[PDB]
Design a protein around this ligand. Sequence first.
Ligand SMILES: *[C@@H]1O[C@H](CO)[C@@H](O[C@@H]2O[C@H](CO)[C@@H](O[C@H]3O[C@H](CO[C@H]4O[C@H](CO)[C@@H](O)[C@H](O)[C@@H]4O)[C@@H](O)[C@H](O[C@@H]4O[C@H](CO)[C@@H](O)[C@H](O)[C@@H]4O)[C@@H]3O)[C@H](O)[C@H]2NC(C)=O)[C@H](O)[C@H]1NC(C)=O
Ligand SMILES: *[C@@H]1O[C@H](CO)[C@@H](O[C@@H]2O[C@H](CO)[C@@H](O[C@H]3O[C@H](CO[C@H]4O[C@H](CO)[C@@H](O)[C@H](O)[C@@H]4O)[C@@H](O)[C@H](O[C@@H]4O[C@H](CO)[C@@H](O)[C@H](O)[C@@H]4O)[C@@H]3O)[C@H](O)[C@H]2NC(C)=O)[C@H](O)[C@H]1NC(C)=O
Ligand SMILES: *[C@@H]1O[C@H](CO)[C@@H](O[C@@H]2O[C@H](CO)[C@@H](O[C@H]3O[C@H](CO[C@H]4O[C@H](CO)[C@@H](O)[C@H](O)[C@@H]4O)[C@@H](O)[C@H](O[C@@H]4O[C@H](CO)[C@@H](O)[C@H](O)[C@@H]4O)[C@@H]3O)[C@H](O)[C@H]2NC(C)=O)[C@H](O)[C@H]1NC(C)=O
Ligand SMILES: *[C@H]1O[C@H](CO)[C@@H](O[C@@H]2O[C@H](CO)[C@@H](O[C@@H]3O[C@H](CO)[C@@H](O)[C@H](O)[C@@H]3O)[C@H](O)[C@H]2NC(C)=O)[C@H](O)[C@H]1NC(C)=O
Ligand SMILES: *[C@H]1O[C@H](CO)[C@@H](O[C@@H]2O[C@H](CO)[C@@H](O[C@@H]3O[C@H](CO)[C@@H](O)[C@H](O)[C@@H]3O)[C@H](O)[C@H]2NC(C)=O)[C@H](O)[C@H]1NC(C)=O
Ligand SMILES: *[C@H]1O[C@H](CO)[C@@H](O[C@@H]2O[C@H](CO)[C@@H](O[C@@H]3O[C@H](CO)[C@@H](O)[C@H](O)[C@@H]3O)[C@H](O)[C@H]2NC(C)=O)[C@H](O)[C@H]1NC(C)=O
Ligand SMILES: CC(=O)N[C@H]1[C@H]([C@H](O)[C@H](O)CO)O[C@@](OC[C@H]2O[C@@H](O)[C@H](O)[C@@H](O)[C@H]2O)(C(=O)O)C[C@@H]1O
Ligand SMILES: CC(=O)N[C@H]1[C@H]([C@H](O)[C@H](O)CO)O[C@@](OC[C@H]2O[C@@H](O)[C@H](O)[C@@H](O)[C@H]2O)(C(=O)O)C[C@@H]1O
Ligand SMILES: CC(=O)N[C@H]1[C@H]([C@H](O)[C@H](O)CO)O[C@@](OC[C@H]2O[C@@H](O)[C@H](O)[C@@H](O)[C@H]2O)(C(=O)O)C[C@@H]1O
Ligand SMILES: *[C@@H]1O[C@H](CO)[C@@H](O[C@@H]2O[C@H](CO)[C@@H](O)[C@H](O)[C@H]2NC(C)=O)[C@H](O)[C@H]1NC(C)=O
Ligand SMILES: *[C@@H]1O[C@H](CO)[C@@H](O[C@@H]2O[C@H](CO)[C@@H](O)[C@H](O)[C@H]2NC(C)=O)[C@H](O)[C@H]1NC(C)=O
Ligand SMILES: *[C@@H]1O[C@H](CO)[C@@H](O[C@@H]2O[C@H](CO)[C@@H](O)[C@H](O)[C@H]2NC(C)=O)[C@H](O)[C@H]1NC(C)=O
Ligand SMILES: *[C@@H]1O[C@H](CO)[C@@H](O)[C@H](O)[C@H]1NC(C)=O
Ligand SMILES: *[C@@H]1O[C@H](CO)[C@@H](O)[C@H](O)[C@H]1NC(C)=O
Ligand SMILES: *[C@@H]1O[C@H](CO)[C@@H](O)[C@H](O)[C@H]1NC(C)=O
Ligand SMILES: *[C@@H]1O[C@H](CO)[C@@H](O)[C@H](O)[C@H]1NC(C)=O
Ligand SMILES: *[C@@H]1O[C@H](CO)[C@@H](O)[C@H](O)[C@H]1NC(C)=O
Ligand SMILES: *[C@@H]1O[C@H](CO)[C@@H](O)[C@H](O)[C@H]1NC(C)=O
Lengths: 321, 321, 321, 162, 162, 162
Amino acid sequence: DQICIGYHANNSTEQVDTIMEKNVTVTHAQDILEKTHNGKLCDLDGVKPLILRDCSVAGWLLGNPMCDEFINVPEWSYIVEKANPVNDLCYPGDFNDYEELKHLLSRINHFEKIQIIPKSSWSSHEASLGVSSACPYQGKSSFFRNVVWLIKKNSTYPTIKRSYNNTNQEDLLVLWGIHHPKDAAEQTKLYQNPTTYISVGTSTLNQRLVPRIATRSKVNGQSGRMEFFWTILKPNDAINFESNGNFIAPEYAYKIVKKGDSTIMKSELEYGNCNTKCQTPMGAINSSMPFHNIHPLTIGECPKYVKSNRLVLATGLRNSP
Amino acid sequence: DQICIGYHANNSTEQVDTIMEKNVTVTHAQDILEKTHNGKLCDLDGVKPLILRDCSVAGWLLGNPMCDEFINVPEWSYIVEKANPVNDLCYPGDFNDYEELKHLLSRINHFEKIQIIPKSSWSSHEASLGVSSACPYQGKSSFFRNVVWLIKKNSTYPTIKRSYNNTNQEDLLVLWGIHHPKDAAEQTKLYQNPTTYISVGTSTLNQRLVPRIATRSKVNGQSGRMEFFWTILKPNDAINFESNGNFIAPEYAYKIVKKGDSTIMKSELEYGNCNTKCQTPMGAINSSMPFHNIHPLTIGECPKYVKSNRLVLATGLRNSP
Amino acid sequence: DQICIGYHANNSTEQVDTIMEKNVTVTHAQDILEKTHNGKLCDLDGVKPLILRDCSVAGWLLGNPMCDEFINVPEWSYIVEKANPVNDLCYPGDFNDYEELKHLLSRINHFEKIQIIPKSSWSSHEASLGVSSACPYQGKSSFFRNVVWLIKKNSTYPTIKRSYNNTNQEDLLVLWGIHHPKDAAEQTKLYQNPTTYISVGTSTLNQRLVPRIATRSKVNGQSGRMEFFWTILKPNDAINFESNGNFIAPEYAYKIVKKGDSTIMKSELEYGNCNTKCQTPMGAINSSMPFHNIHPLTIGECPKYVKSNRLVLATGLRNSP
Amino acid sequence: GLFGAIAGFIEGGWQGMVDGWYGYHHSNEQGSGYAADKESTQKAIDGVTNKVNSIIDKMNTQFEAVGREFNNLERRIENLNKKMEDGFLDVWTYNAELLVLMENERTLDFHDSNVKNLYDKVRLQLRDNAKELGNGCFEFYHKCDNECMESVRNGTYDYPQY
Amino acid sequence: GLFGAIAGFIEGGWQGMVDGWYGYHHSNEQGSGYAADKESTQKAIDGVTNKVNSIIDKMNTQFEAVGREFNNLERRIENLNKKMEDGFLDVWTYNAELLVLMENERTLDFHDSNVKNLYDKVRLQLRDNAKELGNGCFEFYHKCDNECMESVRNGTYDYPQY
Amino acid sequence: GLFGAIAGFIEGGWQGMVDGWYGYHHSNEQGSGYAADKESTQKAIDGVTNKVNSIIDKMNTQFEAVGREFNNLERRIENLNKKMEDGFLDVWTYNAELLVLMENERTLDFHDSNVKNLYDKVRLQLRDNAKELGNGCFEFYHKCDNECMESVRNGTYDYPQY
Ligand SMILES: *[C@@H]1O[C@H](CO)[C@@H](O[C@@H]2O[C@H](CO)[C@@H](O[C@H]3O[C@H](CO[C@H]4O[C@H](CO)[C@@H](O)[C@H](O)[C@@H]4O)[C@@H](O)[C@H](O[C@@H]4O[C@H](CO)[C@@H](O)[C@H](O)[C@@H]4O)[C@@H]3O)[C@H](O)[C@H]2NC(C)=O)[C@H](O)[C@H]1NC(C)=O
Ligand SMILES: *[C@@H]1O[C@H](CO)[C@@H](O[C@@H]2O[C@H](CO)[C@@H](O[C@H]3O[C@H](CO[C@H]4O[C@H](CO)[C@@H](O)[C@H](O)[C@@H]4O)[C@@H](O)[C@H](O[C@@H]4O[C@H](CO)[C@@H](O)[C@H](O)[C@@H]4O)[C@@H]3O)[C@H](O)[C@H]2NC(C)=O)[C@H](O)[C@H]1NC(C)=O
Ligand SMILES: *[C@@H]1O[C@H](CO)[C@@H](O[C@@H]2O[C@H](CO)[C@@H](O[C@H]3O[C@H](CO[C@H]4O[C@H](CO)[C@@H](O)[C@H](O)[C@@H]4O)[C@@H](O)[C@H](O[C@@H]4O[C@H](CO)[C@@H](O)[C@H](O)[C@@H]4O)[C@@H]3O)[C@H](O)[C@H]2NC(C)=O)[C@H](O)[C@H]1NC(C)=O
Ligand SMILES: *[C@H]1O[C@H](CO)[C@@H](O[C@@H]2O[C@H](CO)[C@@H](O[C@@H]3O[C@H](CO)[C@@H](O)[C@H](O)[C@@H]3O)[C@H](O)[C@H]2NC(C)=O)[C@H](O)[C@H]1NC(C)=O
Ligand SMILES: *[C@H]1O[C@H](CO)[C@@H](O[C@@H]2O[C@H](CO)[C@@H](O[C@@H]3O[C@H](CO)[C@@H](O)[C@H](O)[C@@H]3O)[C@H](O)[C@H]2NC(C)=O)[C@H](O)[C@H]1NC(C)=O
Ligand SMILES: *[C@H]1O[C@H](CO)[C@@H](O[C@@H]2O[C@H](CO)[C@@H](O[C@@H]3O[C@H](CO)[C@@H](O)[C@H](O)[C@@H]3O)[C@H](O)[C@H]2NC(C)=O)[C@H](O)[C@H]1NC(C)=O
Ligand SMILES: CC(=O)N[C@H]1[C@H]([C@H](O)[C@H](O)CO)O[C@@](OC[C@H]2O[C@@H](O)[C@H](O)[C@@H](O)[C@H]2O)(C(=O)O)C[C@@H]1O
Ligand SMILES: CC(=O)N[C@H]1[C@H]([C@H](O)[C@H](O)CO)O[C@@](OC[C@H]2O[C@@H](O)[C@H](O)[C@@H](O)[C@H]2O)(C(=O)O)C[C@@H]1O
Ligand SMILES: CC(=O)N[C@H]1[C@H]([C@H](O)[C@H](O)CO)O[C@@](OC[C@H]2O[C@@H](O)[C@H](O)[C@@H](O)[C@H]2O)(C(=O)O)C[C@@H]1O
Ligand SMILES: *[C@@H]1O[C@H](CO)[C@@H](O[C@@H]2O[C@H](CO)[C@@H](O)[C@H](O)[C@H]2NC(C)=O)[C@H](O)[C@H]1NC(C)=O
Ligand SMILES: *[C@@H]1O[C@H](CO)[C@@H](O[C@@H]2O[C@H](CO)[C@@H](O)[C@H](O)[C@H]2NC(C)=O)[C@H](O)[C@H]1NC(C)=O
Ligand SMILES: *[C@@H]1O[C@H](CO)[C@@H](O[C@@H]2O[C@H](CO)[C@@H](O)[C@H](O)[C@H]2NC(C)=O)[C@H](O)[C@H]1NC(C)=O
Ligand SMILES: *[C@@H]1O[C@H](CO)[C@@H](O)[C@H](O)[C@H]1NC(C)=O
Ligand SMILES: *[C@@H]1O[C@H](CO)[C@@H](O)[C@H](O)[C@H]1NC(C)=O
Ligand SMILES: *[C@@H]1O[C@H](CO)[C@@H](O)[C@H](O)[C@H]1NC(C)=O
Ligand SMILES: *[C@@H]1O[C@H](CO)[C@@H](O)[C@H](O)[C@H]1NC(C)=O
Ligand SMILES: *[C@@H]1O[C@H](CO)[C@@H](O)[C@H](O)[C@H]1NC(C)=O
Ligand SMILES: *[C@@H]1O[C@H](CO)[C@@H](O)[C@H](O)[C@H]1NC(C)=O
């Protein structure tokens, strides 16, 4: 008669690593790394992202004619932009402090577009001939819809002096611009005055722009350039413009109604018709694992990202052959 | 007859955590995390801090009339500044490269103020009418005490050409400024000349400022602005000024006599009448512990900061019920 | 009769540390930290570095007359520059975005210098009198060899309008400059025209420089200054210049033929006549150890840097006295 | 293993013991079979469970990367940003992999320890009333019926009775 | 514990042993009492002390945050700065908490080991001149007076004498 | 050590055992000598070797500093850069030093364990056919010639034969 002491074995082939030994077969194990995703861009907690498609943040905000899909976008959870969106600045130029603005957007979920300076109210200047073949719309020459390219009327560009007072409760994103012409002839052709400027002031802002002239290569068939600027006009503050010419005046500006958690996600993928609690640029995640290895840039309630191919903890004991 | 092997027990209720078990009662333990502070701003090793109170670094250095307390401050250990000091730039404007200067201060313990261009020596310009209601002192209009707001004399602003040679052994912090007027009328009213400038040169520096005019909102009842600039004039080097108007000339500059370890600490607290070897923005620390969890920004001989609520090491063994 | 169980001992004095005990003598150990270097700058995988000696990256690229050694340098593995090279900008001034360019170089192994605007082709301006005592060569006044200091011819500086089209396959580094004169007399003396400019354009670039005048201290016996600028001209793109005076025109520009892994290493050492697979600013490394403590900035196939004085793993067991 | 029981003096585990991690196998005239030791098994389940949760929880606060963009003349800070983000990922990847390796070793050893202690517990009861065979088993000098066997599993093996 | 002594085959500690961490309790016709084992106790004090100092010292060099300020159009680098400083705090907080957990486990096991080894030391002297009771105690076959007891604590227990 | 064998009940090692880490010393009328236990020795070599490679490999991906330069009015980001690079060096220096300390402790204990288990293996064969002396040695009741000794080292010691 005997009694023996022993331990459990089973048919398990699960393996774990240790410092001294690799591929130890154990009776039980627990995988803690999520390796799969659905490969789609999805609603985050039901709230759809803003998918800019072929438009950039600039094309969107300035109102590139090809970006009318985003004329009045609802609240978003996150933003998706391609690596090289084709519909950027239709008329070539620069966007001043573009990156600092994109960063500002990561703290914004919703814009409300409103009119601050009507197009009709330019009674001393020509406001409806500010177009170009570089910005086409249905076969015809158009322009950034949110700003007004003003030119001379009956051979006269009188000094502009306009003021807008932010009577809204919300911070306001104001956009404007300056046109850099090809040569001296074009300057007088569009604006008459050979030496012009744009002065912009607010509570804090103290700007004065002058158009720079130079021979330039033709981007989208244009030797002229547009340099765009922005500011955040706080409530009860007023913005003041003064100019001799080359002024790209604001028509519409965006109210900042909702501030919160957001991000601009770089991805070539389109909308998945889909919902998730955790999104990556490669696809969404539905997992209870504490770790994943899909992509480092995520948004939502996510596992922690690691570069591992494999993380498996032993729970049971060394399994017998 | 018998002999037994055993181990110590006592009345201890100290508990420690392990990977596999939490709240294990042990006979002896050692807490290694400092959790307490005295809640005061104190002398560091006997050397009192500079407590700016309601003044900012700008108000202090430029010589805001409300900041006379700091007209000639002694050596400091560290500097304390509120989050929103009310006595900043009394006359509205900007301070150029303000943050880079504040960073420079973290390597400075003592300034010595000296006069480089006397107020009396402006024999062709009016130097005693450079005041404003925006910078009041005892009910009367005053101005930043360390710079001189020069205006026309008998309807004339002749070209200024002044040079100062750093004959001191110490690096010298030089401050100056430019006035941005409301409109063309005010420009000629103060300085006569419609088109002016300020050119500043040193061994390295090559500056030329021009006043920018624009309609601006009224901060402290002023539509004009003051933009302030600085440089470090090295020994045996000379600074050269030239201007038509709008020049805010230096009177006093600061010698850098002592360079060492310092910091600008953001805090709403006042002086504690107190001494310590380790200071935080929330209060000082007197501890022999290797860790603390008070605040990450400290100065002096301090424990290492961690985010833990609790760090307790077992020394003894598992205590018996 | 008996049989005993025991373990190995030997004459080893190797020691290792543990958490609970330091300096435990063990029978066998393995050192894993490389502590030695050869103290020399060496070829990396046979490919010699560019050792600038007394020249800086600016002196080299602009073509400082004292830096003719580097008139046409072959492919390099890495670059070595002193902390304070004496042959920098011979004529005093600034190099615009100098650090961003040096960073660009860390991704470059080889330049090919080519002529884009011949010196002879300046038929309306004097191109062979653009020299200074600040840039001496064999006792005579010379100048940066890669740019042309143009001045008036027969008392006339007509407007320059030059264009170069990048027909090469490679990206092209283009350098140019602006002269800042001492006073109004010198301006008309060199260039006639009192108010001048330089306008530079490319596909992206939209520049317009104006010479700033001021009284300045004499560096290398000069009160005038040279401010230098650069851009990367992409293939099939054209650069356009226009100027009234003060233009320092390009003659030679550098093709970027090889892009790869490189670095600018700060060191006072000279060439060792030597070869290695891993280089530091203090000397090279030939080791199979996984760690070293020589210097953090390395290039090549290197061990990982740590701040330890000692890393020794136990392999054997506790050795007996 | 460090403790010498699992795949040591006990050569292999038991497919036939389904209801616990460690236990007993008895063999007498009435028959034979397996019985799990409840106490030591539940001890093991609590320790390993607490460990997993401790591991998961400690990795809770950890670096999260954010999107930042930079223009063509901001290459230095762009590189800084990239080196910063990668640096933290490498650190947390190292932490996670090393913790799993280290604690897996300790989990296997822990089980080995629990078996060794259960074996000693029984050895210390039986003393010289049984032959220690050297393989995990004890051969009795007296007959040990099922109640006798149960008293061994109990902790109640009445040594003076035999 | 891993070694099976503390709160294992020795059910509980002794309030009555005040002068050391581990030791002996004797019981005979002359009386009874506790005596600390000096050697094993001092060994334990040295190990634990070295450990604490090793822990403290390793955390000596560690990230110190510095104040840096940024204007309204330097949000990207301000965020970089913040993410950098927080990143290192989280890393060092993790290191400190994990080290305390891991080494606390090893400290408790170390004590368990020291008790087990002291018990075996005595078992190996007495051999078959005493009954191993199964609870930390040894019942002698011969009378063991105070000098007899002392020789057990000595290491000098003269086995052939009994 | 945790397992009590090395510099414990076995007072010291053997200069005379050259061909392995652990083994046997025999002593009878025919003579005496050392013999290494092949199996347990090779086990130890595999574990320690795997450990070293595991250590080396885990430190493979680790922070590499790059040169970045900044002008006189970029002091804030220069400081950021420096604090970033130093921060990671301190972290990886800590990781490396702590890993070496922790694993050195485990390597010494591992050897101690291997000796203890080899000792128990032999004890469990001999049982009551030899006196356990208390110092690593077993004194036989019967004569044990070289073939007898070999069977102990074998695992084949025929207990019923004696
Ligand atoms: C952009 O436009 C907005 C409005 O369209 C400007 O804000 C307003 O600015 C005016 C001055 O131009 C101020 O007028 C007077 O209003 C307050 C009213 O008092 C309180 O109660 C009402 C309740 O309806 C509330 O709206 C106010 O916020 C306030 O709490 C007057 O008390 C005050 O008049 C004073 O009289 C005192 C003697 O009785 C004098 O000592 C004072 O010197 C003063 O004259 C004031 O002048 C509005 O207060 C103000 N409203 C708001 C909501 O801000 C805004 O300034 C403009 N921006 C720019 C940049 O121009
Ligand atoms: C701001 O002001 C300071 C002084 O107020 C300027 O520094 C001085 O600049 C002058 C030139 O304007 C130099 O003058 C001459 O002084 C040296 C003296 O020699 C040595 O010994 C004295 C001991 O007292 C010491 O002070 C000096 O530092 C120096 O080591 C002369 O040797 C030298 O004259 C030379 O004569 C040689 C033939 O004998 C010639 O070959 C040379 O070409 C040269 O003419 C020199 O010219 C001072 O040296 C200088 N002092 C100091 C302390 O710097 C400073 O330049 C000014 N800044 C600006 C931006 O203008
Ligand atoms: C700097 O200089 C270079 C050349 O020195 C400029 O690049 C060239 O620019 C010219 C326009 O000025 C273009 O001319 C015509 O060439 C293509 C040829 O077609 C293809 O096949 C050849 C094979 O040899 C290849 O070289 C080309 O790359 C191309 O793939 C013509 O097809 C085209 O002409 C068109 O005719 C169509 C009707 O047939 C019309 O609808 C079109 O509107 C168009 O007129 C074109 O115009 C060259 O293509 C171009 N070559 C290269 C290699 O880039 C460069 O533009 C200049 N830079 C600046 C900033 O000015
Ligand atoms: C663990 O196991 C031992 C051995 O099985 C237990 O002892 C046995 O306990 C049973 C159930 O209580 C006893 O049965 C009872 O016997 C009495 C007297 O004959 C009778 O009046 C009851 O109706 C019932 O049948 C049994 O006698 C007893 N046997 C022996 C040999 O001791 C023990 O109780 C268990 N202890 C623990 C802590 O689990
Ligand atoms: C550890 O303890 C044992 C047992 O107590 C020690 O043996 C005893 O040692 C004492 C003190 O040295 C001896 O006392 C002496 O006896 C002689 C002869 O009678 C006498 O001349 C002296 O004046 C003194 O009284 C005692 O005889 C002895 N007893 C026995 C039973 O051995 C032992 O020395 C200790 N060893 C160590 C390493 O601590
Ligand atoms: C481990 O060692 C034991 C003891 O040395 C081994 O047993 C011995 O094995 C040898 C070699 O096989 C035997 O020798 C042979 O004996 C037979 C019969 O006399 C003879 O015909 C052969 O020519 C040869 O001499 C020897 O008898 C035997 N001795 C004893 C006492 O058992 C055993 O085989 C070894 N086992 C292992 C697993 O290594
Ligand atoms: C408001 C206005 O003046 N619109 C013009 C525009 C501007 O004058 C010009 O872009 C400013 O630099 O120019 C437009 O013509 C230029 C255009 O002409 C085409 O024939 C040619 O194919 C193009 O390469 C280009 O030169 C324009 O379309 O942009 C006309 C517009 O009405
Ligand atoms: C040196 C000088 O000219 N000081 C004036 C000052 C400046 O002309 C002006 O600030 C430059 O922009 O203006 C002062 O008057 C302006 C002031 O007038 C008050 O009546 C009113 O309450 C204010 O809103 C403001 O318009 C000034 O005090 O700043 C007078 C000063 O002497
Ligand atoms: C192209 C040209 O004009 N070269 C001049 C040069 C420039 O006019 C000047 O540097 C622009 O600011 O000036 C040179 O003379 C100046 C020089 O004169 C020496 O006598 C004196 O020793 C120096 O301090 C300095 O003033 C020059 O060498 O730079 C002559 C050159 O031909
Ligand atoms: C442990 O097992 C893993 C998983 O099977 C092994 O990984 C395989 O290795 C072989 C040979 O190197 C390759 O052909 C396979 O591609 C690997 N498979 C996977 C899924 O990664 C690993 O090599 C084993 N390690 C050791 C030390 O034995
Ligand atoms: C271990 O003990 C700590 C300290 O007592 C426990 O913390 C308390 O938890 C209870 C219930 O969650 C709360 O009501 C108290 O607020 C906590 N007190 C403190 C001081 O933190 C902890 O919950 C215990 N943990 C376990 C696993 O038993
Ligand atoms: C362990 O040994 C090292 C190496 O010998 C000791 O380091 C020496 O320490 C002494 C006294 O502090 C100094 O005089 C020497 O300069 C040190 N030598 C080296 C090479 O570093 C160390 O002190 C010992 N540590 C302990 C705890 O005993
Ligand atoms: C392993 O055994 C389990 C019993 O728990 C059974 O469910 C499963 O089907 C078996 N798998 C294989 C591959 O035999
Ligand atoms: C996620 O996956 C689980 C399976 O584990 C599934 O039951 C659940 O419905 C999924 N949730 C969502 C939101 O897709
Ligand atoms: C615990 O016992 C110690 C004796 O060391 C004594 O000083 C202390 O007062 C006791 N505390 C309690 C609460 O009983
Ligand atoms: C700090 O606290 C200790 C108590 O641990 C006290 O004795 C000492 O005086 C204090 N030191 C200072 C400078 O306050
Ligand atoms: C130690 O012993 C080894 C034998 O392996 C021998 O080669 C070496 O010379 C010895 N060294 C010393 C210092 O005795
Ligand atoms: C590096 O050192 C080894 C010695 O370990 C030597 O044999 C080898 O030649 C050296 N290699 C080079 C490239 O210097």
